[PDB]
Each structure stands twice: as structure tokens, then as C-alpha cells.
């Protein structure tokens, strides 16, 4: 009975787990999407995201796609935080009877975020498996580190693109249908191959208090960015940016637009606060609230509760 | 009717990895980039429930082990540790004590090599998975390209001990002898060799750390040199355990020390004269023009551990 009352991580959860990692390890840099590092008068950001055969895709799905993605999560931290990435390694699960031509094709997905977000594959690891496992890390740099602490009283929060597109992706990838419309295909790109928000990192880097990305859903990262900068976050759902697509999803599927911006995850879009004085002429952000004094988000004057994506 | 892993093998799918991605960098224990007039050493290695470890091996052991296998890396090309990352894939019914006690683990390696784990990811899964990455710094990498004709081939430390401890492990004995406790922890607890880095940096025309086997591990360094390497059997280093154990099991130790596989120990090459009379290195072979491993002037066939 040597396990019948001991503590799983299911009962735990994952964010209690690495609570308990970081006090272990009596670490004061975890806690935001990447690890500053003091070196050469810069600063270097380590991170590190994986997808995993059945947890972040199907075997079904286009390797190049798989490729992509890999790339573009792990830069989506790194983009978030202030940084451009600069080197990459990725290690592999591989199961024996897969394939050569999917780890190929694979590849060449990854040597195309590369080549755009201009970054490199320096190297990495290849272990055996039951299924298909892809952990990869990235080294970013920046002049200016902006985690999830430093949001300030007044400041407004605002978030890049559009939100929910990506689960609706992911629910059409599940239907295995024969063919998709237009607008189905569109929200499938954003859920299988999403764009790190490179384009937002000047801007972040100098002006954002604080900024983190979207990837387990607008209240549930929200609430990782209100805890970790001690405020409170006002969101109003009136003022979500929603796609047509996403509003053709929902409207064919039955669904609320609003549940998908609120609780969707995968979109990788930013999120980030600082004085709404502060923007740029170039950059698609939307303000969807405000930092106030206290604890907790609350959307449209409700606290609500935070959902988002668990791992366990 | 498609060319799967198995037959490719893994080393050739990572020729057409490095070809597909046209890079130069890949190829050697780490990843060496020019950073601040110095160079940054990247690398990964990963531990997997039924492929390196098994679950009820002690947590503290494997969080040891983790940390130590990467900065073997690090430190067989010339550099020292410096900051990790650590991905895990974690079972929901795993008991937490066992993620607490697997850092505390990597807490004392960290504290040992004098690095630090800054950051890392949890990801659900069926068995457990553990992926380091770590970053490390030198002032001269020293690759497995390199080595040069007349030079004396080394090795760290004793060699074969690792394998003699997983065979004792996979016995699942009530209990061990003294000698046989200390084979299973060389397995279980293996210790990076960061006491040959200033050594490495100085002497070391090329070097690498022996994680699937002496033999197979030499081809590698020889082919990346381009050159052959001679290895005399009987120069072979051999621990008192692992001759006791061959002794007990009826077993050749020369086997163990050529194809046994996880003692991260280090091989080296350079003018004999460089030998250090501080260290526990020992000559067992040397740098000739031509290619191939010999051992005992026979071409034996690279073996070492292999995932397909
Ligand atoms: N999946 C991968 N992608 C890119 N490079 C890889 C991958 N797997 C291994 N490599 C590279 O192949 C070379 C040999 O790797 P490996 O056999 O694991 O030796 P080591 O563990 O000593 O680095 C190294 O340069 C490694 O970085
Ligand atoms: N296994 C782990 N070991 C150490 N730190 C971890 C581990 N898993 C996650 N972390 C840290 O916990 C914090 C939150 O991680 P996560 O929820 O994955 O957010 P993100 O993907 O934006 O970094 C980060 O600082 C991350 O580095
Ligand atoms: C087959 C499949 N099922 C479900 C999902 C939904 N999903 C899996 S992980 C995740 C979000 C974020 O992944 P995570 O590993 O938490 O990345 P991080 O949040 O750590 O960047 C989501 C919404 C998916 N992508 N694929
Ligand atoms: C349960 C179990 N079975 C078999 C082994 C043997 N084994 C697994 S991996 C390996 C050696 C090296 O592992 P690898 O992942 O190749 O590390 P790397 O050479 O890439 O540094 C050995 C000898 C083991 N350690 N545990
Ligand atoms: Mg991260
Ligand atoms: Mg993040
Ligand atoms: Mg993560
Ligand atoms: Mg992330
Ligand atoms: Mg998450
Ligand atoms: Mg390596
Ligand atoms: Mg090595
Ligand atoms: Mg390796
Ligand atoms: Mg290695
Ligand atoms: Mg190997």
C-alpha cells in the first residue's frame, strides 16, 4: 500500500508542479516565457516548447506543417519577451518504423521558419520511441527583457491579430473531413502553422511593461501575467479582435465567437500592457482593457474563471 | 513500401538532417557559436522511461544523471557548463515526489558542475520523458575534427563499467556485493569529466565523450578527422569491479571496455608528450593517415549503442 495515498500530478496540476520545480531549484528567473541571462552587456533568452504525437498533432498532418510550427512556437516566446532568436536544437523522439520521408519533410518545414524568422538549427538529439516527440530550444537576444512583471497601474492591455482562430482550426483538423471551404482552410493555417509575432519585438522591447504570448487562452495566460505583476486585468469582450472566418465558423458550427476568443488556445498572438498613449502606426494591436489595482481578471466586470489548456 | 528509420539507421538520418538544413556547424558533441569574441557550446541529450532508465530507478539517480550526461558533452569539446533547460514529458498518475526528488537530484549536479537550470516545459505523456538542453563557454573548442598523424588516442577514467552495471540492474537481485553497488552506480550516477576541460582546452588536437561505446565512437572520431585509429586491446583501462564482475559472471572484459556503452568517459588525441601525470588518463592507441578503427590491427566492426 505503498502508493495509495501519495500525490499524483494530476491532483497537483501543472502550474503547481513547477511552483514546486522552482522552489526546489530556489530559482528567481522562472516564471516568464523565456530565461534572461546576463552576458556581454545583453541579455540572451533561453526557452524551450515541444509537440508531441496526439498532444499538439496528428501524424496525419503535413510533416512541413509539423516543421513550421515547431519553429514558430519556441520563436513565439522568444518574440515575446523582447527578443529575436538566433539558434536552435531539437531533439527527437522517433518511433523505428517511421518513415525517413516524414523526418525529411519535416526538416524542410523547420529550414523554412528558419530562413524567415532568421534563425538556425545548430543541432540536436535523436532518441527511439513509441510515438512521435519534438522537443526543440531556442536562444533568442535582446537590449531590453520584458516579462510577465512590470505591468503598471493605468497601463492598457492590449493583444495582436485575432483570437479563437486557432481552436477553431484544430476542431476542423479533428473532423478528418474530405475538403474544407475557404475560410476553414484559413483558420486550419492558423492553428498548424502560426506566425511568431517577429514583427511586434521593436516595439515590445520598447515600450511594453510587460508582454507574454497566448498559447493555453486569453483568461488563462491573462491570469499568469495579473499573478506574476500583481495587479488586477479589466477585460471587456465587446472589444476582442475577431476574424470573418472565425464568425463564418461559429455561425455554421453553432458556436460563440467569444468563448473561442476567451478560452482558445494556439494562437500564439501577444499580449502585453503598457500606457495606451503608447502605439504604432504599423502594428494590428487591439487594447481589450486595462491594469487596475488588486488581483485576478475579470472580463466584462465578471471574474470569471480562468480555463485555458492543461496538461494535467 | 517506404524506407523507414530502422533502415536508414540513426546516424544516417542525421547525414541527411545535417543535408537538408546545408549546415556545417553539425557533427560534433556540441554546437560551438561565436559570441562576444568567445564561443557558446549547445547541446541535447534525453533520458526515456524503457530506453535510458527505468521509473523505479531512484528519481534523485536519474535527475543526477541528466544533468551529467549533457555537460559530458560540454566539456569533451573544451567547454564548461553554464545554463540548462530541462522539457519533461510527465504521466498524469506520476507521484509529485518524484519530479521533486529528480530536481533535487539535478540540483546537486547543477551545484557539482557549477551551473544552473533556468527554465524548461511540462508536456503530458505515457512514459517518461527527459530532454536537457544546456549551454556552456569556452575559449578553444576542440571538436572531433582534428586529429593528427603520430598522435597518441587517450581515454578517461576505466572503461565498460556502465554496461556491467545495467546488466547487474536488469538481474533484479534481492542485493549486490560491494563491487557489483559500485558498477551500478557508474550507471546510474555517471560523472561528467569537467576535471579534463583546462586539459582539452591546452593539449587536444580532437575529442569527444564515450557515450555508446569505445569502437563505435572512435569511427566517429576517426571519419570526422579522416584518419585511422589503431587501438591496442590490452592498453585498455579495466576497473578492479568490472574484472571482478567478469570474473563472477564468466565474462571478458575487453568486450565491455570496447562495446560497453554510458560511462561518458572522454577520447582524446595528441602528441604522447602531453600526457598529464595528474589525471587518469591512459594511451590505448594512436592517429595514423588512412581510415578505419583497428583493434589489435584487426578492423573490427563498429557495434555501440544504436536507436535503429
Ligand atoms: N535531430 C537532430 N537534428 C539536428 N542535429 C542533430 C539531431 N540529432 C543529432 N544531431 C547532431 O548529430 C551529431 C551527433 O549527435 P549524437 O550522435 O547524439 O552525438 P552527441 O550526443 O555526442 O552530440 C551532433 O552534432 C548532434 O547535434
Ligand atoms: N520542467 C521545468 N523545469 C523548469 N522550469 C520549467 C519547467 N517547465 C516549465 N518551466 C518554467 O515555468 C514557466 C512557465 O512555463 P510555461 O507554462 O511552459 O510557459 P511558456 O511556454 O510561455 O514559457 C517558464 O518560466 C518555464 O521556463
Ligand atoms: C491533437 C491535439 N489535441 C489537442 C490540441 C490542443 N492543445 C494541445 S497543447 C495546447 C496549447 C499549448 O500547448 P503547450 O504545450 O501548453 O505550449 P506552451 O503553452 O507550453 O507554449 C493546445 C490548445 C492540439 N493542439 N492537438
Ligand atoms: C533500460 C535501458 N536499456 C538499455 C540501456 C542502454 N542504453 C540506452 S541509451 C545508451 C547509450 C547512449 O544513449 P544516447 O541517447 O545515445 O546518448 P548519446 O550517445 O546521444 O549522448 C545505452 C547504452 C539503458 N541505459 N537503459
Ligand atoms: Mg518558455
Ligand atoms: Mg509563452
Ligand atoms: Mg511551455
Ligand atoms: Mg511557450
Ligand atoms: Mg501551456
Ligand atoms: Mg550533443
Ligand atoms: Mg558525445
Ligand atoms: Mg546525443
Ligand atoms: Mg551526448
Ligand atoms: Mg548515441
Same mark, same amino acid.
Given at each position: ?117 532568421? #534563425? /538556425?538549427?545548430? &543541432?540536436? %538529439? ?6 512521435? @516527440? ?7 537576444? $535582446? ?106 465558423? #461559429? /455561425?455554421?458550427? &453553432?458556436? %460563440? ?6 478560452? @482558445? ?7 502585453? $500592457? ?39
Amino acid at each position: 500500500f505503498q502508493g495509495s495515498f501519495t500525490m499524483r500530478l494530476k491532483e497537483l496540476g501543472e502550474f503547481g508542479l513547477i511552483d514546486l520545480i522552482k522552489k526546489t531549484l530556489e530559482s528567481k528567473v522562472i516564471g516568464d516565457d523565456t530565461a534572461p541571462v546576463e552576458y556581454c552587456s545583453k541579455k540572451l533568452l533561453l526557452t524551450t516548447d515541444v509537440l508531441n504525437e496526439g498532444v499538439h498533432f496528428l501524424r496525419s498532418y503535413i510533416p512541413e506543417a509539423v516543421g513550421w510550427k515547431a519553429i514558430s512556437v519556441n520563436v513565439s516566446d522568444v518574440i515575446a519577451n523582447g527578443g529575436l532568436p538566433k539558434w536552435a536544437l531539437i531533439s527527437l523522439n522517433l518511433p523505428e518504423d517511421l518513415e525517413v520521408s516524414y523526418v525529411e519533410r519535416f526538416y524542410i518545414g523547420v529550414k523554412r521558419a528558419c530562413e524567415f524568422y532568421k #534563425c /538556425e538549427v545548430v &543541432g540536436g %538529439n535523436i532518441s527511439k520511441s513509441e510515438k512521435i @516527440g519534438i522537443s526543440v530550444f531556442l536562444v533568442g537576444e $535582446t537590449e531590453r527583457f520584458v516579462g510577465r512583471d512590470g505591468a503598471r497601474l493605468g497601463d492598457s492591455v492590449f493583444v495582436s491579430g485575432t483570437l479563437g482562430d486557432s481552436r477553431a482550426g484544430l476542431e476542423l483538423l479533428l473532423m478528418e473531413k474530405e475538403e474544407y471551404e475557404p475560410f476553414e482552410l484559413a483558420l486550419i493555417q492558423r492553428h498548424l502553422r502560426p506566425t511568431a509575432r517577429i514583427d511586434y519585438v521593436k516595439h515590445i522591447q520598447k515600450y511594453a511593461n510587460a508582454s507574454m504570448d497566448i498559447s493555453d487562452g486569453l483568461v488563462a495566460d491573462a491570469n499568469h501575467l495579473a499573478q506574476r505583476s500583481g495587479v488586477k486585468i479589466e477585460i471587456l469582450s465587446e472589444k476582442l479582435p475577431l476574424s470573418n472566418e472565425l464568425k463564418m465558423y #461559429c /455561425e455554421k458550427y &453553432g458556436k %460563440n465567437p467569444i468563448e473561442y476568443a476567451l478560452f @482558445g488556445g494556439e494562437d500564439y498572438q501577444l499580449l502585453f $500592457t503598457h500606457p495606451k498613449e503608447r502605439w504604432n502606426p504599423f502594428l494590428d494591436m487591439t487594447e481589450i482593457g486595462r491594469v487596475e489595482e488588486g488581483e485576478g481578471v475579470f472580463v466584462d466586470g465578471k471574474k470569471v474563471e480562468p480555463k485555458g489548456w492543461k496538461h494535467f
